[PDB]
């Protein structure tokens with residue numbers, strides 16, 4: 239029933255996540271993304287409530303897709319002989335943060351604050367639903383350009399949240415924390431805070447702080463652009479080498495630099511229209 243119920247359009251992208259195409263739901267003209275993944279190329283599986291075997295990505299998406307979140311929500315999925323096909327939300331118009339930064343260069347602090355705050359709310363939501371994303375970065379963040387609302391994509395590299403150690407990582411090396419590099423061991427939250435550190439630096443600097451492993455192990459941050467003393471502090475605190483020196487999400491959200499954030503609407507007025 240799938241090829242009848244959604245109207246396929248252009249290819250939006252392809253990579254390690256499969257092939258995403260633009261789509262329109264026939265029922266009510268809703269714009270959507272259709273994501274095809276080959277069964278052969280799924281290393282991590284799981285099983286939902288009703289007890290059937292699906293890719294872990296579907297498990298995790300189902301857990302975060304209730305209500306309004308800053309997460310692109312799963313609407314439906316289909317199994318095919320050799321692929322799995324996912325129907326997700328599609329903002330119209332849209333741009334990933336990587337392209338946005340690549341185009342507009344480093345971001346005014348006011349804008350980064352809105353954006354980063356929103357990311358934090360989304361990641362909190364995920365954690366609160368028992369999900370760990372494990373691959374927070376600019377290319378997994380979409381911007382609805384009209385509403386100013388940021389939205390997270392690309393689960394599995396994700397996992398269920400747990401308080402024990404993780405000894406596996408199939409996310410992005412340059413966003414991985416020193417404890418992963420050295421010891422092949424990390425804990426979800428503190429490793430998330432690291433990657434948010436990198437995210438925030440990316441936003442205000444136009445580029446990621448570390449390229450090689452030795453730079454990560456060293457954990458030392460130079461600023462090529464004018465960035466406020468308070469923003470530099472927050473960045474360095476998130477990028478603390480010892481995980482227990484890193485802030486909690488609460489501590490991040492109460493940090494002086496995170497004060498008087500703009501709402502999404504007004505962010506777009508000022509910065510995207």
Ligand SMILES: CCN(CC)CCCCN1c2ccccc2Oc2ccc(Cl)cc21
Nearest residue numbers: 251255258271310326327328333334391392
């Ligand atoms: C490469 C260019 N851009 C798109 C503007 C980023 C790739 C986005 C592909 N993608 C995507 C990539 C990886 C996992 C899920 C994904 O779901 C999506 C949902 C909705 C949209 Cl619009 C896009 C995705």
